[PDB]
Amino acid sequence: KVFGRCELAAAMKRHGLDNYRGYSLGNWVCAAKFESNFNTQATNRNTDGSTDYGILQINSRWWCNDGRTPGSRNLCNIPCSALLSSDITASVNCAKKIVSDGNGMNAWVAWRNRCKGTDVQAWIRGCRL
Ligand SMILES: [Cl-]
Ligand code: NA
């Protein structure tokens, strides 16, 4: 599923991401924009052999099981395929664990490089929230 910007903002809000660990909704929508371009089906192989999955490009080295990442953990206790669903519940639940891991949203390199310090409120501007 390719979400609309405000459609994704509404779904992230319903699932409790709006100001989760102090990160406003625009931060989450900005991260999704540059990670996946709002595509739930996005996958990307990393140099280390891990893969990133879904709207927030969650990595198989720590967070989900894909059966092909040697030495990895599954700290969200989910198949990585669950992160590609049109229903973002699994991605949101796993993102809450990741953002709580100690470095906040710096866990998402694209958030640090393209969202951090920017006018992230622009990502929810015009949305009925
Ligand atoms: Cl933080
Ligand atoms: Na894994």
With respect to residue 89, please indicate whether it lies within any of the assigned structural domains: yes
The structure was resolved to a resolution in Å of 1.5
- Residue 129, in any domain of the structure: no
Q: Does some domain include residue 63? A: yes
- The active-site residue out of 7, 35, 48, 66 is 35
Range of the domain at 95: 5-124
Residues in the chain preceding a C-to-N separation beyond 2.5 angstroms (breaks): none
Which ligand is closest to the CA of 50, given by its number?
Answer: 2
CA distance 100 to 50: 21
Residue 37 lies in a domain: yes
Rounded to the nearest whole angstrom, what is the distance from the C-alpha of residue 80 to the centroid of ligand 1?
25
Distance of CA 105 from the midpoint of ligand 1 (Å): 7
Among candidate residues 37, 34, 51, 29, the one with its CA nearest the CA of residue 2: 37
Whose atoms come closest to the Cα of 68: which ligand? 2
User: For tokens 């931060």, what's the residue?
Assistant: 27
Work out the number of other CB atoms within 10 angstroms of the CB of residue 116.
16
**56 Cα to the center of ligand 2, angstroms:** 16
CATH of the domain at 29: 1.10.530.10
Residue 60 belongs to a domain: yes
**DSSP secondary structure letters along 23-49:** B-HHHHHHHHHHHHTTBTT-EEE-TTS
Residue 106 domain flag: yes
Burial (0-12, 13-18, 19+ Cβ within 10 Å), 38: middle
Instruction: Give yes or no for a contact between 88 and 96, defined as CB atoms under 8 angstroms apart.
Output: no
When divided into structural domains, the chain yields a total of: 1
